[PDB]
């Protein structure tokens, strides 16, 4: 049930809050049971210093929040 | 028995304290054995900077307290 | 044996010390093998800023000490 | 073999060092495989602010050292 | 699926963000289920003090992000 | 193979570095698979405030380094 | 595959980065699946205060990086 939110966000642009002052935005291309994700066209925001990635692998362990697009 | 409190809070508005100066309020739409939750119409409060989400996935690992709505 | 202390505290008012400058007092309504608890009429004390809850779910992982009421 | 030390200290007054500036002294009434303990007539020392408990449950995870009384 | 990104990066030059102010760049020679990696011709950047290694073993546990080379 | 060093140190005086500014010296009387030890005639050094114990139980989880006596 | 690097470093002089400002250099005499190592003629560097050991046991849990000698 709770993971349904991540699953319905496949190919949508998600917001991800990681542990310790880091955030991401990107298109969810893939995820797994551990909450590992691959984000496409991703922006990383340390707070502000930004960084952009064509493809980004995010380690599940460090994910705190995931929000789908308003849509 | 203790998880009964989370279970009876399905569709109620819960308060959630996370690790490290973060709090949430939202409608509990879903949870699992790991204490992962989906919160609807959720407010995040870092302390104070606020943020609002239509739908929010919260990682169970970071949950310290959950309080149901009063009455 | 050691968990007997928590068990005999069912419905008594317990003191709970959590990781990192947080404490609780409340009536133990429920607990489980992970040391998750539901505390009734609970006070949370960060040190001092206080907060009160009619019903509180506490995540076992963060519990360091539990003391039953005196006598 | 190493746990024998804790076992032989049953009913003796043990010193316990916990993670992060905390110490205990008390009569070992019970312990388990996780190193959870119940300490009787226990003194807690944060360093110095002291606190006393008639009975105290200590979570095993946070125990770093245990010393038995000097015979 | 998400690990596919690491797998398709075999022999490419990857960027790796580790916990706590450390980054790496190097040629991915090997990885495993734990996300342990061996990086060839690797640069380590603490932030800035740099360090270079002909071959580097990175512990999986400390990996937060992995980004494959562009284009 | 690596644990052989701990095993050959039985009854020798070992140095032990724990997490977070703590060190021990003592006679290794016992150890287990978790790296729990009992140290005899042990000195604990926080850095410098020292403390001495006739018998000391050390929790394996917090052990970083173990050095056997020279020769 | 990734552990091959550690394995091929048997009897070579390796550099090891541990968690939290600590480094080691020594001759790799032994290692195991957990990444526990015994380092011979080892130097420990906290950053700078140095320390030397004839034989050193290193707990695998705290190892972040391992680099074999050049060529």
Author numbering:
A (entry chain E), B (entry chain F), C (entry chain A), D (entry chain G), E (entry chain B), F (entry chain D), ...: 9 to 55, 70 to 93
Share the article's original sentences.
Sm and Sm-like (Lsm) proteins have been found in all three kingdoms of life: bacteria, archaea and eukaryotes. They are essential parts of ribonucleoprotein (RNP) complexes and are actively involved in various steps of RNA metabolism including pre-mRNA splicing, mRNA degradation, telomere replication, histone formation and translational control. Members of this protein family are characterized by two closely spaced, conserved Sm motifs 1 and 2, which adopt a conserved Sm fold that consists of an N-terminal α helix followed by a twisted five-stranded β sheet.
Structure determination of SpLsm2/3 was attempted at a resolution of 2.7 Å. To our surprise, only SpLsm3 was identified in the asymmetric unit (AU). One possibility is that SpLsm2 was lost during crystallization as the crystals were obtained from the heavily precipitated mother liquor. Consistent with this possibility, SDS-PAGE of the protein samples prepared from the thoroughly washed crystals showed that only SpLsm3 was identified in the crystals, thereby confirming that SpLsm2 was precipitated out during crystallization process (Data not shown). The structure of SpLsm3 was solved by single-wavelength anomalous dispersion (SAD) phasing method using a SeMet-substituted crystal. The final model has been refined to an R factor of 24.3% and Rfree of 27.7% with good stereochemical geometry. Residues 1–8 in the N-terminal and residues 56–69 in the loop region are disordered in the electron density map. In the SpLsm3 heptamer, the Lsm3 subunits are assembled one to another to form a heptameric ring via the interactions between strands β4 and β5′ (where ′ indicates the adjacent subunit) in two neighboring subunits.
